[PDB]
């Protein structure tokens, strides 16, 4: 038999265990390993999971086949093979790739569906085990763990450009015009000492030609250690993850990705020309699988029922921060911002941007930043920042030599942005934010490097009052202390002030004391509400209608009677489109525009605000 070196386990036996997993292993085995028999379905269980997966790979036309170490453990012989893989991940992965190819050929013949066995041979099946082990940081990874299968979660610090890889060397003889191809094993090309052609009779006549040499796609992605894995006292250590073929560019940089792989250690040459290599070995992880960290039909039905409920707007507001008290209007504005307005692009007038930015000002103990962290959790992509920690250059763009790097707002783009101590945030940073928010995109010019980075990020800001506690005598805008251009740029302005009464104090103290009374203590689940916002954006594309247009023109003229920025009217339209997404209405309606204007009026306590100078009586706040 053929045995992997040092394992005393046959490579044929590993392939046979993988074949028993691919066929003659029921999905019932994986479901039983998962237990939860009430959750498992008997018919899909009786069907063979890996047989269905190989047939699905044939239907896709792709050689790659996702692998589950849990399913490998579910099958008994495949569990033994998975332990052998944990010992020798690369060898067992090659064995499983060959087994997947052979099982695909056998499955094509068995199903009798049209397919080419030669096409299956040309295809190189891929085994991508996952759930082999608990996710761990790069700092947790060890040289003993090198050459052992593991599943790792990490946030991509950056993704490197695709790196050419010498899949096979090609030798072309300059003396005799001979053509040859030499496979590259272990990353080293093989060169015959004499000419491949005996008639040439020229020693070392063969010459490698790089263009003729076969190249396989390869890439690397820097991966930061997971925030839980990182030590509390120090920033996480980062190790780049090797990737190739379909795994290359599987996940974009700046988004969390879970890549199962085998850790690798390689000697580092003391000098590139010198054969000598330092006793220390550089360490990198080669990913057997790449994964992240879209609405299911049942989730979409649940979102539809929720959106049908009239209580759902306030329900999602409360669901953003279920434990928090008395900031439901700010949470509703944040939920509208998470839904976002629809974006319209035109040849003239540029492109109206649907993304909504929300500014919130609260006196200390407003729980505004607790709600902001709640919004960061609720957002599908979360960016949280402190005003003292915020920098304008970091928010817009950085340069490394000389190539531009994504700003903090650019990384926020594609998700909601959370800002704490927004009053403490620098006015210069806010001035940088003004242009980026007005354009919904960032443009940067600098010596050497000048480029524009997308900044289409919904922005949430939690701000202190300009006074240490919010002053009713102070104007609400002054208490928020936001610059007027940034306030116009923001779609929504939120004002929250504490109101004191004996019964209200009893209620607040009772809430805090109940959370304390538990030793560990209508709201949608936060993940379900993120999915609801995603489904609202996906299946709802609100646009200005006639009724919404009557409401919008009335609101614009009335706010001009009250001065109305044209951007505020666009922000009201975006909030109206956000409300239609919150209601899962395909187009903006008069009720949506009315709710958007009502949400803006309630957010800044404009109804509470006194008619003159914009100041709000404290009793008027919180009605």
């Amino acid at each position: 038999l053929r045995i992997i070196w040092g394992t005393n386990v046959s490579i044929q036996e590993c392939t046979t265990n993988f074949r028993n997993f691919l066929m003659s292993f029921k999905y019932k085995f994986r479901k039983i390993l998962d237990e939860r028999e009430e959750f498992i379905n008997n018919t899909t269980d009786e069907e063979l999971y890996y047989i269905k997966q190989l047939n699905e790979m044939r239907e896709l036309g792709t050689s790659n086949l996702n692998l589950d170490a849990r399913n490998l453990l579910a099958y008994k012989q495949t569990e033994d093979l998975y332990h052998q893989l944990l010992n020798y991940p690369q060898e067992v992965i090659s064995i499983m790739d060959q087994t997947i190819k052979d099982c695909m050929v056998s499955l094509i013949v068995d199903n009798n569906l049209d397919y080419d066995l030669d096409e299956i041979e040309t295809k190189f099946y891929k085994v991508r085990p996952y759930n082999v082990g608990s996710c761990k940081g790069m700092r947790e990874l060890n040289p003993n763990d090198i050459d052992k299968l593991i599943n790792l979660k990490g946030l991509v610090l950056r993704s490197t450009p695709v790196i050419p890889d010498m899949k096979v060397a090609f030798f072309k003889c300059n003396v005799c015009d001979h053509t040859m191809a030499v496979e590259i094993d272990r990353g080293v090309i093989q060169e015959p000492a004499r000419c491949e052609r005996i008639d040439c009779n020229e020693p070392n006549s063969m010459s490698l030609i790089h263009n003729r040499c076969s190249f396989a796609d390869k890439q690397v992605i820097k991966l930061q250690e997971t925030p839980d894995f990182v030590p509390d006292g120090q920033t996480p250590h980062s190790i780049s993850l090797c990737v190739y073929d379909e795994l290359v560019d599987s996940c974009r940089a700046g988004d969390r990705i879970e890549v199962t792989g085998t850790f690798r250690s390689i000697p580092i040459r003391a000098n590139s020309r010198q054969r000598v290599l330092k006793s220390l070995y550089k360490t990198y992880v080669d990913v057997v699988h790449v994964k992240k960290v879209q609405i299911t039909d049942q989730d979409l039905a649940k979102i539809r029922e929720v959106a049908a409920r009239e209580d759902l707007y306030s329900l999602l507001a409360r669901s953003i921060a279920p434990s928090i008290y008395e900031l439901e209007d700010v949470k509703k504005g944040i939920l509208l911002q998470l839904f976002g307005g629809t974006n319209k692009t035109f040849t003239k007038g540029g492109r109206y941007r649907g993304d909504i930015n929300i500014l919130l000002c609260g006196d200390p103990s407003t729980s505004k930043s607790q709600i902001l962290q709640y919004v960061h959790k609720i957002t599908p992509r979360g960016v949280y920042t402190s005003g003292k920690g915020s920098s304008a250059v970091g928010l817009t763009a950085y340069i490394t030599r000389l190539v531009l790097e994504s700003g903090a707002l650019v990384l926020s783009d594609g998700g909601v942005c959370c800002i704490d101590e927004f009053d403490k945030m620098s006015d210069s940073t806010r001035s940088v934010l003004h242009e980026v928010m007005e354009q919904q995109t960032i443009s940067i010019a600098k010596a050497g490097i000048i480029t524009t980075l997308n900044a289409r990020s919904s922005i949430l800001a939690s701000a202190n009052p300009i006074g240490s506690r919010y002053n009713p005598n102070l104007p609400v805008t002054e208490n928020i202390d936001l610059p007027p251009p940034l306030l116009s740029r923001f779609d929504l302005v939120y004002l929250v002030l504490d109101k004191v009464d004996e019964k209200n104090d009893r209620e607040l103290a009772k809430h805090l004391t109940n959370l304390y009374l538990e030793d560990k203590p209508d709201v949608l689940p936060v993940e379900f509400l993120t999915m609801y916002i995603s489904y609202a954006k996906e299946h709802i594309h609100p646009i200005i209608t006639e009724a919404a247009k009557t409401e919008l023109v009335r609101a614009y003229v009335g706010m001009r009677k009250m001065t109305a920025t044209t951007r505020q009217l666009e922000s009201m339209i975006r909030l109206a489109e956000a409300h239609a997404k919150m209601k899962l209405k395909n187009v903006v309606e008069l009720e949506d525009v009315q709710e958007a204007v009502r949400l803006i009026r309630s957010a800044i306590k404009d109804y509470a605000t006194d008619p003159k100078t914009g100041k709000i009586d404290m009793n008027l706040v919180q009605t």
Partner: protein, 613 residues
């Protein structure tokens, strides 16, 4: 020596395609052996390059030739050149030679255009190397034309034996053995420039379109090699489509002249750098001469518009169709785009022919929208936001090139055209003073890094700004509302004032216009003239050079006296008179009148008085 049967078949097929393409699309469906007739034309001009549409190859041989070319261009290129040489020897033997000194064989270039698919620089892959491909992108830079050693001739010092036209790899190469069998020399090879043949060489760096990037990320850059006629066939900063074979560049140091191949190099590793070779380059980015450049229908449309007596008002209305109101700003933009005749005194003082304006107004007035429309309309124009910009970098750039060199500035992108400036108030007053320093005198120059360089800096300037306090203050003087140099304000032709109108009718009209725009996209706008037609009219007017009349000069005298009376000081000056002359020339251009008129001078004085406010 072994020979590729597929290569020889491809050479025969290419010769057959060239000699008997027999498809002529000229004036009718006809047969003229258009490739052979093009060979005859290249013989008439002694040309060395041939351009072939990829669709012609796709039609020829049922696309077998096109398929072979696309699949293995790198392999069949010598065979294609041999077939072209065979067709040349058959039809134009003079073209076969370089064509008194003995004529060497002429180099033959084959260009392929109109490829079915165009890929972004990010779309390129290592697997795509070695195959013909069309790439869409913008040329960030272009290397100087160089004589790449396509063919090398060496002489052996030991026995005086000489080699000729030796092919060279990516690194410089010498003959493996002495051509003389008796001499065993493998060194002492001395090149001869005359006997060796050098092709023109130029590397043009390219990058993906910033608009093409979805997430706004940095566009992927690709090196495009231009050789022969392809050298200087494109310009830096201009979008272009390149067609040719993708290539991989080995490390010259590893050859001896990240992971790397080894064991071939020998022990040394070899890292591969991706690149592109472009067989074909295409750029995707007097009144009588302009009329000839225009098609017959375009000439007829421009003639009708010029014949219209209301052409001036129609163009002013057509400016910024989406924008409602700001008709004075529209008229100023039209006058600036039309421009004025340059003039220089016998004493040597040179006046500026281009119009320059600065706009100050409250936010949410679509001044930035006007800047965007102007940047889109004006050829050779660049738009930028003032706050996120470098003052010196906009005017000029300097960098070291592999030695100190000079890089083109942002102002040069606006040269011979309008320059739009957004967030002008947010921009540095130092940058504003620099613009004033390079506005009337122009002539941007470099004196740093030990290298002195000159720049013409001939452009029109347009600006948008927010007045002090965030809104225009009518009580506040026109000068000082936007802090800028007084001489610069004087040299500026006009200072537009934008103020919000509380009129309910105007509010309802603007609201209805914005709502109709959002509902109906471009259909809501109804400009009197199309953008392309207005651009053609602007080009024709620029070809025209208005001349001052004697009555026009008397009217200008009276108008300057009236402006001085209005000063009765800082607001009006001889610079205001110069602005009046420039606006009169622009008005004569807009009205298509050959000469300046007293009515045109009156309109110029009215615009200046509107700036006075």
């Amino acid at each position: 020596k072994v020979d590729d049967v597929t290569g020889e078949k491809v050479r025969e097929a290419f010769e057959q395609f060239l000699e008997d393409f027999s498809v002529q699309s000229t004036d009718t469906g006809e047969v003229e052996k258009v490739y052979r007739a093009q060979i005859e034309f290249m013989k008439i001009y002694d040309l060395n390059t041939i351009y072939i549409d990829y669709q012609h190859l796709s039609m020829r041989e049922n696309g077998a030739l096109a398929m072979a070319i696309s699949e293995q261009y790198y392999r069949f290129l010598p065979f294609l050149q041999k077939g072209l040489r065979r067709v040349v020897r058959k039809y134009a033997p003079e073209l076969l030679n370089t064509s008194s000194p003995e004529q060497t064989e002429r180099v033959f270039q084959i260009s392929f255009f109109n490829l079915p698919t165009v890929h972004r620089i990010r779309d390129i892959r290592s697997e795509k190397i070695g195959s013909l491909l069309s790439i869409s992108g913008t040329v960030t830079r272009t290397s100087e034309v160089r004589p790449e050693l396509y063919k090398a001739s060496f002489t052996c010092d030991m026995c005086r034996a000489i080699v000729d036209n030796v092919e060279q790899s990516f690194k410089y190469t010498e003959p493996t053995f002495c051509p003389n069998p008796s001499c065993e020399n493998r060194a002492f090879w001395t090149l001869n420039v005359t006997r060796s043949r050098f092709l023109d060489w130029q590397k043009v760096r390219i990058q993906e379109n910033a608009n093409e990037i979805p997430t706004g990320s940095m566009p992927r850059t690709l090196d495009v090699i231009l050789r022969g006629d392809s050298v200087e066939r494109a310009k830096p900063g201009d979008r272009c489509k390149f067609t040719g074979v993708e290539i991989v560049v080995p490390d010259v140091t590893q050859l001896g002249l990240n992971s790397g191949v080894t064991g071939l190099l020998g022990v040394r590793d070899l890292t591969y750098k991706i690149s592109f070779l472009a067989c074909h380059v295409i750029s995707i980015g007097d009144q009588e001469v302009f009329l000839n450049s225009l098609s017959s229908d375009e000439i007829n449309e421009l003639k009708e518009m010029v014949k219209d007596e209301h052409i001036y008002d129609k163009l002013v209305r057509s400016i910024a169709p989406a924008v409602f109101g700001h008709e004075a700003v529209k008229k100023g933009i039209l006058l600036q785009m039309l421009g004025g005749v340059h003039k220089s005194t016998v004493e040597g003082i040179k006046l500026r022919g281009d119009i320059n304006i600065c706009v100050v107004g409250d936010p949410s007035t679509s001044k930035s929208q006007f800047l965007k429309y102007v940047v889109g309309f004006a050829p050779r124009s660049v738009y930028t936001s003032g706050k996120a910009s470098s003052a010196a970098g906009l005017t000029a750039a300097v960098v070291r090139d592999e030695d100190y060199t000079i890089e083109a500035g942002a102002l040069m992108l606006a040269d011979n055209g309008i320059c739009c400036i957004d967030e002008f108030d947010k921009m540095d007053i130092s940058d504003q003073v620099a613009i004033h320093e390079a506005m009337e005198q122009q002539t941007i120059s470099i004196a740093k890094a030990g290298i002195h360089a000159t720049l013409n800096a001939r452009t029109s300037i347009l600006a948008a700004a927010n007045p002090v306090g965030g809104r225009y203050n009518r009580k506040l003087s026109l000068r000082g509302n936007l802090n800028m140099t007084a001489p610069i304000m004087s040299r500026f032709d006009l200072f537009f004032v934008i103020l919000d109108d509380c009129n309910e009718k105007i509010d309802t009209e603007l609201a209805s216009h914005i709502v109709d725009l959002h509902m109906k996209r471009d259909e809501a706008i109804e400009p009197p003239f199309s953008a392309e037609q207005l651009r053609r009219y602007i080009k024709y007017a620029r070809t025209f050079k208005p001349i001052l009349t004697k009555e026009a000069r008397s009217y200008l005298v009276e108008k300057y006296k009236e402006l001085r009376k209005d000063d009765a000081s800082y607001r009006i000056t001889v610079r205001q008179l110069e602005s009046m002359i420039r606006l009169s020339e622009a008005i004569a251009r807009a009205n298509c009148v050959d000469e300046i008129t007293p009515s045109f001078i009156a309109e110029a004085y009215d615009l200046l008085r509107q700036s006075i406010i």
